[PDB]
Amino acid sequence: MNGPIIMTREERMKIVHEIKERILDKYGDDVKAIGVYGSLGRQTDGPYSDIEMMCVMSTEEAEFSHEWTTGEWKVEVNFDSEEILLDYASQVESDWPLTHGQFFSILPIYDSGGYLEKVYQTAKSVEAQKFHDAICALIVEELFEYAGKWRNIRVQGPTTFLPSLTVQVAMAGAMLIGLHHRICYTTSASVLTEAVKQSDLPSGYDHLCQFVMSGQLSDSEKLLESLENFWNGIQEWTERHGYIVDVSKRIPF
Amino acid sequence: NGPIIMTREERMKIVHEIKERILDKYGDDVKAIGVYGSLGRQTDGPYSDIEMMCVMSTEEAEFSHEWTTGEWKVEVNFDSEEILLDYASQVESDWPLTHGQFFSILPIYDSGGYLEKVYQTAKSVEAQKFHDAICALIVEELFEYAGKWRNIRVQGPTTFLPSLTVQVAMAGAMLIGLHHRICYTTSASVLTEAVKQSDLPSGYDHLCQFVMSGQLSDSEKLLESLENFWNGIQEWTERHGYIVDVSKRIPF
Ligand SMILES: NC[C@@H]1O[C@H](O[C@H]2[C@@H](O)[C@H](O[C@@H]3[C@@H](O)[C@H](N)C[C@H](N)[C@H]3O[C@H]3O[C@H](CN)[C@@H](O)[C@H](O)[C@H]3N)O[C@@H]2CO)[C@H](N)[C@@H](O)[C@@H]1O
Ligand SMILES: NC[C@@H]1O[C@H](O[C@H]2[C@@H](O)[C@H](O[C@@H]3[C@@H](O)[C@H](N)C[C@H](N)[C@H]3O[C@H]3O[C@H](CN)[C@@H](O)[C@H](O)[C@H]3N)O[C@@H]2CO)[C@H](N)[C@@H](O)[C@@H]1O
Ligand SMILES: [Ca+2]
Ligand SMILES: [Mg+2]
Ligand SMILES: [Mg+2]
């Protein structure tokens, strides 16, 4: 297994339509729609891309996937009932900016009743409260946790964790920015480059990303300073924008 | 401006206050309460958060309370026994990161040996599950990463390479942890513990040195090291019998 290998878009689409034929052969009238998502769905796949497809099923409670390799390429096909997919499309978790670009990258190749259009409309019409709640949760569940981890590093080590943690913090900052601006990053590789181009960044986030994007992560004192500055920028930014969590109670239940 | 420095004794006070609140609020529906994580192992440092698990009798109970006081952070998970036992016996790609919870339990209340039963379940998972998880990890994560850094080599962007290299090193540490059936103690010790194990795939220790030192700016050296680690994976998995099925063009 020396793959993945170089492939053309033409070769990838040939594979997509073979999979389409197998899906229709196997599930027949239970198939509501089939779409390609990811880079191939946007027709911006590069030489080494994977193949990602989604199938809307009529079967109640259908929720399964097939993910496999031939050693030279890899495919993931998800199968969901319409109800399960629409619910997923309207839930906003802390990694919504990483997961839900699926619904903005759909290339329908089969659709028996506007089903993929419905999916897109549901994904693009999520209410503002869900993004507000997800941002407040991200601050508590991830950012506050990371601050404790790098502050522990400052006092007791290990600095060998600091480069990885710094990457994690920059990624969480990109989720914060993506939820706030309601943007779904196009690829894994474009998360940080797209995050730092957005407007109204928390102070210190740009600088933190500069270390991560340059790969210059060996100066622990500079990183800890940049992390603290970003944590300060977070505090100012969330109160400016009203992402306020009541922290007054020792036990809030 | 938190989290702040706290002592182990201050954290244990908080834990017992939460225990009292849980028993007042839920009463006889509480089967057991435990602390896990660094505090459960009694190795918490100055800034650690507090993590607790409850076993509930209510069928389908599955919720959590996670909050900060501005100064410290707590997460309390509430699960039925059946939901928790099921979770404790499922082996995903990140089992070495997640299931140390079950080897870190400090019991503080237990009406019927429930925490011990959860621990026994977690420690007795079938070997085949780890095999399946490793084969899944190779396909679903490592093969994906290889395509991503090979795309970087030919079309950029190299600004993704340090973050991607960190991801690959972490995925290699999951592979090692699944193989040796070990749950890393903390986020921070994953890579130092992974590279101390025996039977490392070739190229893995070298790759991790870039990640641990933070020397992630030489893109050609990183790409060469990823390729060597990817080669090392192929020899290693074949040697240990983690054979990925590549025979089907469409496997359904
Ligand atoms: N509690 C047992 C089981 O937990 C599962 O969820 C697991 C996982 O998704 C979930 O992850 C939750 C998130 O969700 C939530 N949004 C933030 C929270 N900090 C995080 O917590 C988890 O991840 C952290 C690292 N990031 C760890 O530090 C932490 O100890 C761990 N409990 O925690 C669970 C593992 O502890 C299922 N809910 C269910 O099978 C069952 O209830
Ligand atoms: N399909 C719609 C919904 O997806 C959910 O799960 C989501 C998520 O956990 C799941 O993640 C799956 C994993 O599990 C599986 N073990 C490896 C697989 N490559 C991964 O795939 C996901 O993460 C990858 C990045 N590493 C992305 O490249 C990929 O596009 C994305 N589908 O993909 C789903 C997003 O597509 C639920 N299954 C369900 O609510 C519903 O089916
Ligand atoms: Ca025990
Ligand atoms: Mg946590
Ligand atoms: Mg994937």
Coordinates of C-alpha atoms in Angstrom, one line a residue, chain B:
Chain B
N1 CA -8.7 36.0 34.2
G2 CA -8.9 32.4 35.5
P3 CA -8.2 29.5 35.7
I4 CA -6.5 30.1 39.0
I5 CA -4.1 28.0 41.0
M6 CA -5.8 25.6 43.4
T7 CA -4.6 22.9 45.8
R8 CA -5.6 19.3 45.7
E9 CA -7.4 19.8 49.0
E10 CA -9.4 22.7 47.5
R11 CA -10.4 20.5 44.6
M12 CA -11.5 17.7 46.8
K13 CA -13.7 20.1 48.8
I14 CA -15.4 21.1 45.6
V15 CA -15.8 17.5 44.6
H16 CA -17.6 16.7 47.9
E17 CA -19.8 19.7 47.6
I18 CA -20.9 18.6 44.1
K19 CA -21.5 15.1 45.5
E20 CA -23.8 16.5 48.1
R21 CA -25.7 18.6 45.5
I22 CA -26.1 15.5 43.2
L23 CA -27.5 13.4 46.0
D24 CA -29.8 16.2 47.2
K25 CA -31.1 16.9 43.6
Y26 CA -31.4 13.3 42.3
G27 CA -31.7 11.2 45.5
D28 CA -32.3 7.5 45.0
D29 CA -31.8 7.8 41.2
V30 CA -28.0 8.1 41.9
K31 CA -26.2 4.7 41.8
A32 CA -22.6 6.0 42.1
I33 CA -20.4 9.0 41.9
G34 CA -16.7 9.1 41.0
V35 CA -13.9 11.5 40.2
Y36 CA -11.7 10.8 37.2
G37 CA -8.9 12.5 35.3
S38 CA -5.8 13.9 37.0
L39 CA -7.7 14.6 40.2
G40 CA -9.0 11.0 40.2
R41 CA -5.4 9.8 39.9
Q42 CA -4.4 12.4 42.6
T43 CA -1.8 13.8 40.2
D44 CA -3.7 17.1 39.5
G45 CA -1.4 20.1 39.0
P46 CA -2.0 23.8 40.0
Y47 CA -4.5 24.6 37.2
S48 CA -6.3 21.3 36.6
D49 CA -10.0 21.1 35.9
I50 CA -12.4 18.8 37.8
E51 CA -14.1 15.8 36.1
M52 CA -16.7 13.6 37.7
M53 CA -19.0 10.8 36.5
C54 CA -22.3 9.7 37.9
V55 CA -24.2 6.5 37.3
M56 CA -28.0 6.9 37.3
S57 CA -30.7 4.3 37.6
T58 CA -33.0 6.2 35.2
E59 CA -33.1 4.2 31.9
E60 CA -31.8 6.4 29.0
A61 CA -30.2 8.9 31.4
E62 CA -27.5 10.7 29.4
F63 CA -26.6 14.3 30.2
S64 CA -23.8 16.5 31.5
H65 CA -23.3 19.7 33.4
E66 CA -20.1 21.6 32.4
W67 CA -19.4 25.1 33.8
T68 CA -16.8 27.5 35.0
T69 CA -16.9 29.8 38.1
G70 CA -14.4 32.0 36.3
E71 CA -11.7 30.5 38.4
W72 CA -12.1 26.7 37.9
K73 CA -14.0 24.4 35.6
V74 CA -16.0 21.3 36.3
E75 CA -17.6 18.7 34.1
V76 CA -20.1 16.1 35.5
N77 CA -21.4 13.4 33.3
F78 CA -24.6 11.5 34.2
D79 CA -25.2 8.2 32.5
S80 CA -27.4 5.2 33.1
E81 CA -25.4 2.0 33.9
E82 CA -26.3 0.5 30.5
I83 CA -25.2 3.6 28.6
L84 CA -21.9 3.8 30.5
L85 CA -21.1 0.1 30.2
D86 CA -21.8 0.3 26.4
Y87 CA -19.5 3.3 26.1
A88 CA -16.8 1.7 28.2
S89 CA -16.6 -1.3 25.8
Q90 CA -16.6 0.6 22.5
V91 CA -13.1 1.1 21.0
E92 CA -12.9 4.1 18.7
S93 CA -9.8 5.6 17.1
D94 CA -9.3 7.8 20.1
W95 CA -9.8 5.1 22.8
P96 CA -6.2 5.8 24.1
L97 CA -7.3 9.4 24.7
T98 CA -10.8 8.9 26.1
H99 CA -10.9 5.6 28.1
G100 CA -8.3 6.5 30.7
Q101 CA -11.4 7.8 32.4
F102 CA -12.1 4.3 33.4
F103 CA -8.6 3.6 34.8
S104 CA -8.6 6.9 36.8
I105 CA -11.7 6.5 38.9
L106 CA -11.7 7.8 42.5
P107 CA -14.9 6.5 44.0
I108 CA -16.7 8.9 46.3
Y109 CA -20.2 7.3 46.5
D110 CA -21.3 3.8 45.4
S111 CA -24.5 1.9 46.3
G112 CA -23.7 -1.3 44.6
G113 CA -20.2 -1.7 43.2
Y114 CA -21.2 0.1 40.0
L115 CA -17.9 1.9 39.5
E116 CA -15.9 -1.3 39.8
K117 CA -18.3 -2.9 37.2
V118 CA -17.6 0.0 34.8
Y119 CA -13.8 -0.5 35.4
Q120 CA -14.0 -4.3 34.9
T121 CA -15.9 -3.7 31.6
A122 CA -13.4 -1.2 30.4
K123 CA -10.4 -3.5 31.2
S124 CA -12.0 -6.6 29.7
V125 CA -12.8 -5.4 26.2
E126 CA -12.2 -8.0 23.5
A127 CA -8.9 -8.0 21.6
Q128 CA -10.7 -8.1 18.2
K129 CA -12.1 -4.6 18.9
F130 CA -8.6 -3.1 19.1
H131 CA -7.7 -4.8 15.8
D132 CA -10.8 -3.4 14.1
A133 CA -10.1 0.1 15.5
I134 CA -6.5 0.0 14.2
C135 CA -7.5 -1.0 10.7
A136 CA -10.2 1.7 10.8
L137 CA -7.7 4.3 12.0
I138 CA -5.3 3.5 9.1
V139 CA -8.0 4.0 6.5
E140 CA -10.0 6.8 8.0
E141 CA -7.2 8.9 9.4
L142 CA -3.7 8.0 8.3
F143 CA -4.5 7.4 4.6
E144 CA -6.4 10.7 4.7
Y145 CA -3.4 12.6 6.2
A146 CA -1.1 11.1 3.6
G147 CA -3.2 12.5 0.8
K148 CA -3.3 15.8 2.5
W149 CA 0.5 16.2 2.9
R150 CA 1.1 14.8 -0.6
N151 CA -1.3 17.5 -1.9
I152 CA 0.7 20.0 0.1
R153 CA 3.9 18.8 -1.5
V154 CA 2.4 19.4 -5.0
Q155 CA 0.0 22.4 -4.6
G156 CA 0.4 23.8 -1.0
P157 CA -0.4 25.2 1.3
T158 CA 2.7 24.6 3.5
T159 CA 1.1 26.8 6.2
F160 CA -1.1 23.7 6.9
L161 CA 2.0 21.4 7.4
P162 CA 2.8 22.1 11.1
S163 CA -0.8 21.6 12.2
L164 CA -1.1 18.5 9.9
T165 CA 2.2 17.1 11.3
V166 CA 0.8 17.4 14.8
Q167 CA -2.3 15.6 13.8
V168 CA -0.3 12.7 12.2
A169 CA 1.9 12.4 15.3
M170 CA -1.3 12.2 17.5
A171 CA -2.8 9.6 15.1
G172 CA 0.4 7.6 15.4
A173 CA 0.1 7.7 19.2
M174 CA -3.4 6.4 18.9
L175 CA -2.1 3.5 16.8
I176 CA 0.5 2.7 19.4
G177 CA -2.0 3.0 22.2
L178 CA -4.5 0.7 20.6
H179 CA -1.8 -1.9 19.8
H180 CA -0.5 -1.9 23.4
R181 CA -4.0 -1.4 24.9
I182 CA -2.8 1.7 26.9
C183 CA -4.8 4.7 27.9
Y184 CA -2.7 7.9 28.1
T185 CA -2.9 9.6 31.4
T186 CA -3.1 13.3 30.3
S187 CA -3.4 15.1 27.0
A188 CA 0.1 16.4 27.7
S189 CA 1.8 13.0 28.1
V190 CA 0.5 11.3 24.9
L191 CA 3.5 11.8 22.8
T192 CA 6.2 11.3 25.5
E193 CA 4.4 8.1 26.5
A194 CA 3.9 6.9 22.9
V195 CA 7.5 7.2 22.0
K196 CA 8.6 5.2 25.0
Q197 CA 6.7 2.1 23.9
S198 CA 8.3 -0.8 22.2
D199 CA 7.6 -1.9 18.6
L200 CA 7.3 1.7 17.2
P201 CA 6.7 2.0 13.4
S202 CA 9.9 3.2 11.8
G203 CA 10.0 7.0 11.3
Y204 CA 7.5 7.6 14.2
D205 CA 10.1 8.7 16.9
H206 CA 11.8 11.0 14.4
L207 CA 8.5 12.6 13.4
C208 CA 7.5 13.2 17.0
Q209 CA 10.8 15.0 17.7
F210 CA 9.7 17.8 15.3
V211 CA 6.3 18.0 17.1
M212 CA 7.8 17.8 20.6
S213 CA 10.5 20.4 19.9
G214 CA 8.2 22.7 18.0
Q215 CA 10.7 22.7 15.1
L216 CA 8.0 22.6 12.4
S217 CA 9.2 25.2 10.0
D218 CA 11.4 23.1 7.7
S219 CA 8.7 21.9 5.3
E220 CA 10.9 19.6 3.2
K221 CA 12.2 17.8 6.3
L222 CA 8.7 17.4 7.6
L223 CA 7.4 16.0 4.3
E224 CA 10.4 13.6 4.2
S225 CA 9.7 12.5 7.7
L226 CA 5.9 12.0 7.1
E227 CA 6.8 9.8 4.1
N228 CA 9.2 7.7 6.1
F229 CA 6.6 7.3 8.9
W230 CA 4.0 6.4 6.3
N231 CA 6.4 3.7 5.0
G232 CA 7.1 2.6 8.5
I233 CA 3.3 2.2 9.0
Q234 CA 3.0 -0.2 6.1
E235 CA 5.8 -2.5 7.3
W236 CA 4.6 -2.4 10.9
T237 CA 0.9 -3.2 10.2
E238 CA 1.8 -6.1 7.9
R239 CA 4.3 -7.4 10.5
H240 CA 1.6 -7.2 13.3
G241 CA -1.3 -8.5 11.2
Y242 CA -3.3 -5.3 10.9
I243 CA -4.1 -6.0 7.3
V244 CA -6.4 -3.5 5.6
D245 CA -8.7 -4.9 2.9
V246 CA -7.8 -3.3 -0.4
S247 CA -9.4 -5.9 -2.6
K248 CA -12.9 -4.4 -3.3
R249 CA -13.4 -1.5 -5.6
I250 CA -16.9 -0.9 -4.0
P251 CA -17.4 -3.1 -0.9
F252 CA -21.1 -3.1 -0.8

